[PDB]
Symmetry: C6
Subunit: 30 residues, 6 copies
Amino acid sequence: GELKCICQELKAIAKELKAIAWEHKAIAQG
Amino acid sequence: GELKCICQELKAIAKELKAIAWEHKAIA
Amino acid sequence: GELKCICQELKAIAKELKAIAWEHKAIAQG
Amino acid sequence: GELKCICQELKAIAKELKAIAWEHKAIA
Amino acid sequence: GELKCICQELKAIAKELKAIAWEHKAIA
Amino acid sequence: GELKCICQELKAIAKELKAIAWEHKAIAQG
């Protein structure tokens, strides 16, 4: 069960980092 | 119990990153 | 020994990200 | 398939962090 | 030696995040 | 093969976070 959780949470982490990346780009573009 | 710990900490990490993401949403 | 280290370092990582999150909120609040 | 998933997601994470890093390069 | 590598890299990651955190402390 | 990938990607992640850290410091220094 632990490995499934780890997979799931890393998916969430990748998701949020993409959001942060897109927000940085948006901020830089004015 | 290491794998359980790893799962738990990653949950926390995901939570904090969401908080950071929603902050960036603000201020464009 | 490796898995213990991994657990320990992820604890540290979660800690620092919470710090960063709180600092962002503080910055946004003026 | 959990280990494969973990590998794949870490790839994505590395990719996004590089994007963030290059943004910071801009604006000094 | 993969698990050792993972441990080592996570140590580095924690270190860099602490640096980033203390930067944010500055500038409020 | 999966563990090798995980090791490799974490190396990349550590690398980018160091870059981000250095950029923050540079920004703070004016």
